[PDB]
Amino acid sequence: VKPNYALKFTLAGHTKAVSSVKFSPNGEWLASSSADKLIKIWGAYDGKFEKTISGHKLGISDVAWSSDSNLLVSASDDKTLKIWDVSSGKCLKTLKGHSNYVFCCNFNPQSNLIVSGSFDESVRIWDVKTGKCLKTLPAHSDPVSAVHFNRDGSLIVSSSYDGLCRIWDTASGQCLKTLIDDDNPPVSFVKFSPNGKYILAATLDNTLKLWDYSKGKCLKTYTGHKNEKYCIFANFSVTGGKWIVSGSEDNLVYIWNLQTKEIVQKLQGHTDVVISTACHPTENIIASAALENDKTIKLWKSDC
Numbered sequence: 001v002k003p004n005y006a007l008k009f010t011l012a013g014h015t016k017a018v019s020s021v022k023f024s025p026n027g028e029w030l031a032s033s034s035a036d037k038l039i040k041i042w043g044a045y046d047g048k049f050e051k052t053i054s055g056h057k058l059g060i061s062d063v064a065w066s067s068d069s070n071l072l073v074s075a076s077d078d079k080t081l082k083i084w085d086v087s088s089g090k091c092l093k094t095l096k097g098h099s100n101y102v103f104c105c106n107f108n109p110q111s112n113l114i115v116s117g118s119f120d121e122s123v124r125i126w127d128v129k130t131g132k133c134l135k136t137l138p139a140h141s142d143p144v145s146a147v148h149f150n151r152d153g154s155l156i157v158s159s160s161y162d163g164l165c166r167i168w169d170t171a172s173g174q175c176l177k178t179l180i181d182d183d184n185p186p187v188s189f190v191k192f193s194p195n196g197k198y199i200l201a202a203t204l205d206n207t208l209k210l211w212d213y214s215k216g217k218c219l220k221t222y223t224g225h226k227n228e229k230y231c232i233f234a235n236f237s238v239t240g241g242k243w244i245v246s247g248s249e250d251n252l253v254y255i256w257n258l259q260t261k262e263i264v265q266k267l268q269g270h271t272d273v274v275i276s277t278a279c280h281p282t283e284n285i286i287a288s289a290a291l292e293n294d295k296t297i298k299l300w301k302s303d304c
Contacts, residue, residue, distance in 0.1 A: 002264040003241055003255060003302040005286055009047030010269075011297035013040055018289035020062045020233065020276045021297055024069040027281050029086075032289060032297055033074055035059035041086065044280065044287075047299055053084055055091045062104045066111040071128070073114050075102035081116055083128065093131030097124055103231070104146050108153035108170070115156050117144030123158050125170065135173045139166060145231045146189050151196035157213075159190035165201050167213060179211055181218070188231040194238055204228050208246060210258070222246075224263050225254045230273055230291075237279040237286070240304035245286060247274030253288045253300070270294050 016035035023030055023044055030042045037060060039053035058077035065072055071092070072084040081095035081102055100119035107114055107128070114126040123139035126132065140160035147158050149170070156168040163184025167177040179201070189202035198219070199211040206227050210220040225248035234246035237255070243264065244256040253267035253274055267286070272293035279286055284302040 003243065003284065003304055005253075005255070005265060005267055005284075005300040005302040007267075007269055007298055008301050009299040011042050011047055011049070011299065012295070013049060014038065014295050016059065016295065017272075017292040018275065018295060018297060019060060021278045021287045021289045022063055022065055023278050023280050023285075023287065024065050025067050025281060026069040027283065028069065030278070030287050030297070030299070031063050031065065031072055033060035033063040034295075035292070037076075039063055039072065039074055039084065042297070044285065044299070045283075051089060053086075053089050055082060056080075061102065064106045064114075066107045066128075067109055068111065071107075071111070073105045073107060075105040075116060077101040079118075081105055081114065081126070083114070083131065095126050095131055095133070097133040097136065098122065103144060106148055108149040109151065110153055113149075113153065113170070115147045115149060117147040117158060119143040121160070121162075123147055123156065123168070125156075125173070137168060137173050139168070140164060142186075145187060146191065148191045150192045151194065155192075155196070157190050157192055157199055159187035159201060161186040161188075163187060165190050165199065165211070167199075177213060177216065179213060179216060188227065189234055191234070193236055200234055200236065200244065202227060202232060202234055202246065208234060208244060208256075210244075220258065220261055222256045222261050225252070226250045230275055232274070233276040233278070235277055235279040237284075239280065239282060240284045240302065245277050245279055247277050247288065249273045251290065251294075253277055253286065267298075267300055269298055270296070
C-alpha cells in the first residue's frame with residue numbers, strides 16, 4: 001500500500017549544489033554531478049565514496065550512464081559534453097557543438113549514441129565512438145530541460161521552457177509529436193516510462209503528469225509538491241510498488257501511488273531543494289540530492 005523508505009546514508013563531499021544523481025545500470029554505483037564541476041562515484045549499497053572525476057571548466061548539470069556501466073556522459077555550462085571512462089577516470093571525448101550551457105544528456109540503450117539538450121534551444125545526437133555530432137535538431141524555442149531515449153532508442157522525448165514536449169524519430173530527426181495542453185507552463189522534466197508507452201512530464205505549476213503519447217492524452221496528474229522554479233528529476237519506481245518519485249522545492253522527496261495519485265510517503269531530511277532523485281534498477285533504493293544549502297546526497301531504502 002505504502003513504502004517505508006528510511007535514511008541509510010548521507011553522502012557528503014561536493015562543495016556546491018548537487019545537480020543530478022543516477023544509478024549505474026548494473027546497480028553497483030551511484031554517480032553524482034554538481035555545480036562544483038565534479039563527478040563523484042559512490043557505492044550504491046554501502047554509500048562508500050569511490051572517486052572524483054574532474055575536467056569540466058564550469059558546473060555540471062547532468063550525468064548519464066552507458067548500458068554496460070563502463071562510461072559516463074556529463075553536460076556542463078562550459079558548453080561541452082564529456083564522455084568518461086569510469087574505471088580510469090579519463091575523458092575519452094569532449095563533445096563540442098552547443099552554443100550555450102548543456103543542461104541534460106543520456107545514452108541510448110545500445111549506447112552508441114548520446115542525446116543532449118541545451119540552453120541554445122537545440123537537441124543534438126552524438127556518436128559515442130567518434131565524439132562527432134550526427135544531427136542538430138531545432139527542437140524548441142527556449143532552453144531544453146530534458147532529453148530521453150525510449151526503451152529501444154528509436155524515439156527521443158524532449159521538454160523545454162517553451163511549454164512543449166516533443167517526440168523525435170532518432171534515425172531521421174523528424175518531430176513525430178508535439179504534446180501541448182490548453183495551457184503552456186514551462187516543462188521542466190520529461191521521461192519515458194520503462195515500457196516506452198507513457199511519458200512522465202513536470203511543469204512549473206507544481207504538477208506532474210503521465211501522458212499516453214500513442215493517443216496524446218494525459219492520464220494521471222500528481223500534485224501536493226512544490227515545483228515552480230527548478231528543473232527537478234522525477235522517476236518511475238518499479239522494483240516493488242509502482243510509484244512516482246520526485247524532488248520538491250520544500251526540501252522533500254515525494255512518492256505517489258502511480259494509479260491512485262495519492263501521496264504515499266514524503267522523505268524529510270534535506271535542507272535545500274531536492275533537485276534530483278534516482279530509483280535503483282533492482283532494489284527498493286532511492287538516491288536524493290539537494291542544492292547548495294545542503295550539498296549532500298541521501299540514500300534511502302524501503303521494504304516495498
